[PDB]
């Protein structure tokens, strides 16, 4: 299933994003699709935001986390829930979720990674995504 990380935040996969009834039942109405290659399965049912990026070292996700912040913050604003998903829900999605938590609750990186890793054990940002979260930390501070 998709993994609830905050009141308003789920972390999941493409197969979670294609499971309409699951999403509806969980009260999701916003979907953060952190992929280039996976579709928006239900346009007209959910509000989408797309981060059209591949799960590769050359991807600069850092440049997109305030956009991601904006959207997820939007979900909460209207009293709703957001699914953050990729293809596997392991790297692009997980990293994004970790960054939001750092920004949002002002959590240390190990703090947030640890928080997210505990609930979604398969979470595993790619090594370049890890470097960037460390940067993000430095940026949030400086």
Swiss-Prot record:
Residues 1-142 form the Tyrosine-protein phosphatase domain. The active site is at 86 (phosphocysteine intermediate). Disulfide bonds: none annotated. It is found in: Cytoplasm; Cytoplasm, Cytoskeleton; Cell junction, Focal adhesion; Cytoplasmic vesicle, Secretory vesicle, Acrosome. Interacts with filamentous actin. Tyrosine phosphatase activity has not been demonstrated for this protein to date. Protein phosphatase which regulates actin filament dynamics. Dephosphorylates and activates the actin binding/depolymerizing factor cofilin, which subsequently binds to actin filaments and stimulates their disassembly. Inhibitory phosphorylation of cofilin is mediated by LIMK1, which may also be dephosphorylated and inactivated by this protein. Required for spermatogenesis. Involved in acrosome biogenesis, probably by regulating cofilin-mediated actin cytoskeleton remodeling during proacrosomal vesicle fusion and/or Golgi to perinuclear vesicle trafficking. Belongs to the protein-tyrosine phosphatase family. This is Protein phosphatase Slingshot homolog 2. It comes from Homo sapiens (Human). The chain holds residues 307 to 448 of 1423 of the full protein.
């Amino acid at each position: 299933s998709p993994t609830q990380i905050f009141e308003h935040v789920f972390l999941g996969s493409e197969w979670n994003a294609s499971n309409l009834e699951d999403l509806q039942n969980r009260g999701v109405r916003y979907i953060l699709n952190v992929t280039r290659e996976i579709d928006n399965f239900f346009p007209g049912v959910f509000e989408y935001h797309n981060i059209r990026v591949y799960d590769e070292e050359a991807t600069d996700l850092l440049a997109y986390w305030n956009d991601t912040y904006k959207f997820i913050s939007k979900a909460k604003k209207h009293g709703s829930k957001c699914l953050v998903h990729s293809k596997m829900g392991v790297s692009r999605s997980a990293s994004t979720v970790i960054a939001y938590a750092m920004k949002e609750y002002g959590w240390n990186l190990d703090r947030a990674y640890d928080y997210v890793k505990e609930r979604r054990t398969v979470t595993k940002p790619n090594p370049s995504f890890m470097r960037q979260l460390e940067e993000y930390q430095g940026i949030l501070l400086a």
